[PDB]
């Protein structure tokens, strides 16, 4: 099964997914492998999301490529993926849904945020505490194009659906019901 994340830069994305890991290790020894894959355990710097010339510099195109290998190098039937990314592109979030569709495995979104305000107040503090990193900040254009460009998952289309919302004040019940559907999702 793949869990791809999604949400805002510095929303909680890396926060909840760890909680999911652990959430899934217990559920699993109470059967599945689980995986983790990040834009920090694949090396790709924040940077990559700031024509017609190739250049060498990888590009967040790139960035993509790199996150759709990693996955379908472990996604499968009997393998939980949790894909811990901004993911903010229904394109690319419909490739994601595709690539579950061919690993015969199936597959969900969840959002992750406080508020771009609170998010706005991470990013300020990780560069004020100062590069395969999960706190490494964004540099302060990056992070406001990033926000406005997200695309909010729509549970109107089959590739954002089932959609799991996670909000910071959701405490730790709140979040292990949503996990639970989670685990009956990914399941028969
Ligand atoms: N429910 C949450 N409640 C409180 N703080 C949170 C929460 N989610 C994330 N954070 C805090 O906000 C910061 C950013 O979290 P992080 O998961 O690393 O963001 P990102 O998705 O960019 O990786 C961390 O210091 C983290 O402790
Ligand atoms: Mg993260």
């Not at 690539?99 to 015969?104: F, G, L, Q, V, W």
């Not at 964004?138 to 089932?162: A, I, K, Q």
Request: hydrophobic share 35%; proline share 4%.
């Amino acid at each position: 099964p793949l869990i791809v994340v999604t949400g805002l830069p510095s929303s909680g994305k890396t926060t909840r997914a760890r909680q999911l890991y652990a959430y899934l290790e217990e559920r699993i020894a109470s059967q599945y492998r689980l995986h983790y894959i990040s834009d920090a355990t694949l090396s790709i710097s924040r940077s990559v999301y700031d024509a017609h010339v190739r250049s060498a510099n990888a590009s967040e195109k790139d960035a993509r490529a790199a996150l759709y290998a990693a996955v379908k190098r472990v996604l499968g039937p009997k393998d939980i993926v949790i894909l811990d990314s901004l993911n903010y592109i229904k394109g690319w979030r419909y490739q994601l849904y595709c690539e579950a569709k061919n690993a015969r495995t199936p597959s969900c979104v969840l959002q992750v945020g406080g508020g771009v305000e609170k998010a706005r107040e991470v990013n300020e503090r990780r560069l004020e505490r100062r590069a395969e990193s999960d706190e490494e900040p964004y540099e302060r254009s990056n992070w406001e194009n990033l926000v406005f460009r997200y695309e909010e998952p729509n549970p109107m289309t089959r590739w954002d659906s089932p959609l799991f919302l996670l909000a910071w004040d959701d405490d730790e019940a709140q979040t292990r019901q949503v996990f639970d559907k989670i685990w009956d999702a990914i399941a028969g």
